[PDB]
Amino acid sequence: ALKVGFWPAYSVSEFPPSKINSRLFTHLYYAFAELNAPTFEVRVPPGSEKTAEDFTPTVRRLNPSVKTLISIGGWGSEVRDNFAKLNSDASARQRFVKSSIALARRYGFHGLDLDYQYPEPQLEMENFVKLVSELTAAIREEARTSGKPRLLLTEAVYFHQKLFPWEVVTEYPVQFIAAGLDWVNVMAYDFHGSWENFTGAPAALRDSKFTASVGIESFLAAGMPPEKLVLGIPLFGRSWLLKNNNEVGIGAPAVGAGPVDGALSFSEIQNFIRGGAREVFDTTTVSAYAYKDNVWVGYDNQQSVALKVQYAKEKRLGGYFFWSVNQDIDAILPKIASDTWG
């Protein structure tokens, strides 16, 4: 029963690792170590060494059984560019593999995660396969030589097994992934946002082709063992500015990104509601939204999270993950999620 949370190092001054309620998790990720092109000596951002070192001892104080992983990469054009350069170069792949394993041990992490959005087109999937295969072997080798349990290995995946469902450029090799990785983190969010001029449920469980369930279905149909899938749930919402203040439902016309640049933390959504926004639960999509004047935000709330976590349990998944834990300062949704699975 995997209860996973991502902590982004950017949030340190407002949400240090000590603020994480680690009682509500089995695994916590430090996001992110950098690829460090062109040498690919993987490292935490220079100047954050102390934060990275203290992360695991700090979170374990509240729940000593909690384990940690360090995630490499993250969303971003530069990260994608760097994985693409890395994966085509056998020597660079060797440097990456050696340095990433050494990094996890250096800072006391129990595993590694690759956050690569995304290994497409086909050539990029093929070269990512080379990187991951070599990493899996090196992880097993380090376990033998050190005598310690092998590092865990996970990766972020698109919500769907096919990249992309509308135009198939490539797809995740599920048998390969099941063999080399402990699990994958299914990014079942950002289905809708301010890039569309109409409001929608950004992480709809069901509805449309862009839903968490359809994505999960696609991985299972391909032959992914259910226990290898960990369902992502966002701790942020996607916001729009409304074209008309009297049109406030799902599918309402919009004119651009709401605060803050199209994304709002769950905690800020709670502030929004306490400041007069109306919360609506949408049963059709299994989601929530809130609005006030010209601002509209779609997100997951207490009810939709419980429904998603039960869904994951029903689908026999390995568990769930939250992106990202700093966005729910009072850990409202991680509490509901943990209680639901138990």
Ligand SMILES: CC(=O)N[C@@H]1[C@@H](O)[C@H](O[C@@H]2O[C@H](CO)[C@@H](O)[C@H](O)[C@H]2NC(C)=O)[C@@H](CO)O[C@H]1O
């Ligand atoms: C289901 C799907 O393919 N959704 C796409 C969105 O992912 C994407 O939005 C972007 O998602 C990133 C991570 O998923 C975010 O980091 C990023 O902020 C977000 N971009 C914006 C402008 O909000 C959109 C836009 O490219 O396309 C969807 O198809």
